[PDB]
């Protein structure tokens, strides 16, 4: 600690006083993972290996829940030419938890797959299928010439009144009009049937051959995790500082039995600061109180390097059961200084009416402050004390007036 | 007819525990002191719009109401959701129902066809007391909250306060714009409750030590 004080002061000599050199934080003893006990694997097969993909104008949405979703196999598959994830990295997907994962599958012409991303523009992004600007998920596409080719069954919407909102789909088939005439059920002046087929010939030009594209969308705000990666739950431990992971909720703290009256549908509890402070263990279903691991500033009491190299360390606001002479001072328990029942003037303050000093074979002592010498004034209803002499006292007083005029 | 909702219809916005805290939240709440339509269905049950969410309340001695119907066309053309409680079980299913002009239950009735979802469990309606419900359909989730309270006021909602807690939370994800309640009758002559629509409002919720909402403030009221 003396070298720490020298280092933080950036000086080889240290004056008498108390210096905050570093911050103490009891480290996590173990790592804990508690994922839900879901056994069944996730039906990604029927999403990607489906017999037929819907047209881009009428993209098909599947809802995915109650999964042990293995995204490593999808990521490592060589079929996918484009594996792009925006709100999450592909490697991390095997260790996250999601609620109500969606999978939007549809077929699309090749080079225009770049329109499938946040903030894009173009006919597919504008008028057929649009992702939100804050999209969190992955866009997965691959060549499908050997399956979707010629073939003319698949279509895409060319004509439409306005840009689509995110994740809406248009099924209307009425004749759009670009001209002013009422083109009611007829392709009149500058009027067209809104849907026209793709020309997926078996050897169409590069970028025109069909592409099957699947878009995975993840929701994270909702409490109960239903889709989770294939992590392995660790045995639970309580009453010690550990790294914990409940349904993807990474954190560090001390887990303790909770008295909070969680209802069965409730999984988490939030503090007044709107931070998670309680959690239901997803296997035992018991409620565990989360508290931060003990921490506090570290202060070094130094008599001065010119006086001695001995020092005492104060760990602020901690109990000495967590720290690894020892004394439980109210302002954080103090080590390296011996408590003494005497009382002296405050040499080096610590807190809570306790100070430390270097005194007599000398050592750093710790004592309660003596406010002053006791005095009982000899008051009586007919007694007065009058001075018979005097002393002229000259006392110096120093006052700052100015400081240097920097510019 | 119309009546005044004296701070009724507030519910737990999310399924997260909060205790001894005043929480400000933005969600589709029923405005305080709003006009709730009072339907004297017993001397009928019209199809009513579903304006982003509905607050439904009723009080009868004989539990005439037994369920609800949701959808857009309420015919075979579009998917529709059915909830109904008979004497022993609830049944929730989402099918292209061909609903008749007057849906009800006899001393028992269904129109299901060609569908995907079904569920059964104990009934939340049972055989004086006020039954309140709040319906929502957002982000692909269809949700029902509920709360049952004894009362003594005869022909108006009580002045008291009680938050509605979740009762149903399903990821049905169907389009809903209209709904209609259904009743149980001792007759089959095919040809009472309050309704109020939710609005986006900012509320301040007082959570007590036990985690229950004990009071609330409608920030835009006054």
């Amino acid at each position: 600690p003396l070298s720490e004080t020298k280092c933080t002061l950036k000086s080889f000599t240290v004056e008498k006083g108390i210096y905050q050199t570093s911050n103490f934080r009891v480290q996590p003893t173990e790592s804990i993972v508690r994922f839900p006990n879901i056994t069944n694997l996730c039906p990604f097969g029927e999403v990607f290996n489906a017999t037929r993909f819907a047209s881009v104008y009428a993209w098909n949405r599947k809802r995915i829940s109650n999964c042990v979703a293995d995204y490593s196999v999808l990521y490592n598959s060589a079929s996918f030419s484009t594996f792009k994830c925006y709100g999450v990295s592909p490697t991390k997907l095997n260790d996250l938890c999601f609620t109500n994962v969606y999978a939007d599958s549809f077929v699309i012409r090749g080079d225009e797959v770049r329109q499938i991303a946040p903030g894009q523009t173009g006919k597919i992004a504008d008028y057929n299928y649009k992702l939100p600007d804050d999209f969190t998920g992955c866009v997965i596409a691959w060549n499908s010439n050997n399956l979707d080719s010629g073939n003319y069954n698949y279509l895409y919407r060319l004509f439409r009144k306005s840009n689509l909102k995110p994740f809406e789909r248009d099924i209307s088939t009425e004749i759009y009009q670009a001209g002013s005439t009422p083109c009611n059920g007829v392709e009149g002046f500058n009027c067209y049937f809104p849907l026209q087929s793709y020309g997926f010939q078996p050897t169409n030009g590069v970028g025109y051959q069909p592409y099957r594209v699947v878009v995975l969308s993840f929701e994270l705000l909702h409490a109960p995790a239903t889709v989770c990666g294939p992590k392995k739950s660790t045995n639970l431990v309580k009453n010690k500082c550990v790294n914990f992971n409940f349904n993807g909720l990474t954190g560090t703290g001390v887990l303790t039995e909770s008295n909070k009256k969680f209802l069965p549908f409730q999984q988490f509890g939030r503090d007044i600061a709107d931070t998670t402070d309680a959690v239901r263990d997803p296997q035992t279903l018991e409620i565990l109180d989360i508290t931060p691991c003990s921490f506090g500033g570290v202060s070094v009491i130094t008599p001065g390097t010119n006086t001695s190299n001995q020092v005492a360390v104060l760990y602020q606001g901690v109990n000495c059961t967590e720290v690894p002479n020892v004394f439980q001072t109210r302002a954080g328990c103090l080590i390296g200084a011996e408590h003494v029942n005497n009382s002296y003037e405050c040499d080096i303050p610590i807190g809570a009416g306790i100070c430390a000093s270097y005194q007599t074979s000398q050592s750093i002592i710790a004592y309660t402050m003596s406010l002053g010498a006791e005095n009982s004034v000899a008051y009586s209803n007919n007694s007065i004390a009058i001075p018979t002499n005097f002393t002229i006292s000259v006392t110096t007083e120093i006052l700052p007036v100015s400081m240097t005029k920097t510019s | 007819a119309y009546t005044n909702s004296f701070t009724r219809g507030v519910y737990y916005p999310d399924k997260v525990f909060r205790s001894s805290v005043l929480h400000s939240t933005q969600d589709l709440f029923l405005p305080f002191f709003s006009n709730v339509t009072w339907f004297h269905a017993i001397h009928d049950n019209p199809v009513l719009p579903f304006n982003d969410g509905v607050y439904f309340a009723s009080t009868e001695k004989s539990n005439i109401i037994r369920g609800w119907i949701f959808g857009t066309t309420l015919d075979s053309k579009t998917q529709s959701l059915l909830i109904v409680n008979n004497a022993t079980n609830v049944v929730i299913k989402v099918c292209e129902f061909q609903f008749c002009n007057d849906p009800f239950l006899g001393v028992v009735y269904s129109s299901a066809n060609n569908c995907t979802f079904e569920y059964v469990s104990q009934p939340f309606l049972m055989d004086k007391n006020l039954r309140e419900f709040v319906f929502k359909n957002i982000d692909g989730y269809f949700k029902i909250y509920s709360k049952h309270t004894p009362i003594n006021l005869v022909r108006d909602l009580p002045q008291g306060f009680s938050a509605l807690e979740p009762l149903v939370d399903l990821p049905i994800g169907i389009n809903i714009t209209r709904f209609q309640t259904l009743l149980a009758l001792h007759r089959s002559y095919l040809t009472a409750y309050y309704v109020g629509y939710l609005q986006p409002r900012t509320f301040l919720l007082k959570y007590n030590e036990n985690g229950t909402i004990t009071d609330a403030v409608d920030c835009a009221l006054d």
Epitope: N66, P224, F262 | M126, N129, V168
Partner: antibody, heavy 133, light 112 residues
Framework: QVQLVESGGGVVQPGRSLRLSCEAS????????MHWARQAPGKGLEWVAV????????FYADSVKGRFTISRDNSKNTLYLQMNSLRAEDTAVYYC??????????????????????????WGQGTTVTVSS | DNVMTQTPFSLSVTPGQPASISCKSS???????????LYWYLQKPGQSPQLLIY???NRFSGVPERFSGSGSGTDFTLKISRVEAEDVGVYYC?????????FGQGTKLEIK
């Protein structure tokens, strides 16, 4: 079949503490509330205590208030009862018993009936606790 | 407290004869949900109790059909259509409307 196996009996002196244990198998343990009940010899049954499915809510009978602590560990499928501060009248056979009503499966969207304590469904083998000088 | 009683303290029944054993309570067992909360348990000589009737008229799964019961308010009774030899034991009635769960003092059933 529903299996409950009590353990932790024997003879003891007044004033000390003891632990009973109940193994459970053959059903989803963590979703069921659990009861402790006892039968003193030659006298009728007596409900001792009940624990909630998550262990959140605990209740005990008037004869045992302040003293007994009911606890469970859903990971091990075990139920416990800490027998602090014994007197002679605690001489009895003790049974761990299941609650008839399990809580609703939250993975389904339906949250009715509210979780409530109900009578004893299935009773275990039972063990004898004798406290006397 | 919901004190409860059963009479007669011991009923002696020939094999095959019907039997009737009663239970009573101080306060009504009807709950605000509409259910009437009464539970009955059979304890034959030499093992733990067995649940027979879980609501006033509802027999537990696996119970033989001969067991049946009825009642309302504070008066309840269980009927046995015909007493067989294994029915010997002590019958305990219990309320579950409020905690603590209070049993009756128990009533013996024996062969004449």
């Amino acid at each position: 079949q529903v299996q409950l196996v009590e353990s932790g009996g024997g003879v003891v002196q007044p004033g000390r503490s003891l632990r009973l244990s109940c193994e459970a198998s053959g059903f989803t343990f963590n979703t069921y509330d659990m009861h402790w009940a006892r039968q003193a010899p030659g006298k009728g049954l007596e409900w001792v205590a009940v624990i909630w499915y998550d262990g959140s809510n605990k209740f005990y009978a008037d004869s045992v208030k302040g003293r007994f602590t009911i606890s469970r560990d859903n990971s091990k499928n075990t139920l416990y009862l800490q027998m602090n501060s014994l007197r002679a009248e605690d001489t009895a056979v003790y049974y761990c018993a299941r609650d008839r009503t399990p809580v609703y499966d939250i993975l389904t969207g339906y949250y009715w009936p509210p979780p409530r304590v109900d009578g004893m469904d299935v009773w275990g083998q039972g063990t004898t606790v004798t406290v006397s000088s | 407290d919901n004190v409860m009683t059963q009479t007669p303290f011991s009923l002696s029944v020939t094999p095959g004869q019907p039997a009737s054993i009663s239970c009573k309570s101080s306060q009504s067992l009807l709950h605000s949900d509409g259910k009437t909360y009464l539970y009955w348990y059979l304890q034959k000589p030499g093992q733990s109790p067995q649940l027979l009737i879980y609501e006033v008229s509802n027999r537990f799964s696996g119970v033989p059909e001969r067991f049946s019961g009825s009642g309302s308010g504070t008066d309840f009774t269980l009927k046995i259509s015909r007493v067989e030899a294994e029915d010997v034991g002590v019958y305990y009635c219990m309320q579950s409307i409020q905690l603590p769960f209070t049993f009756g003092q128990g009533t013996k059933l024996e062969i004449k």
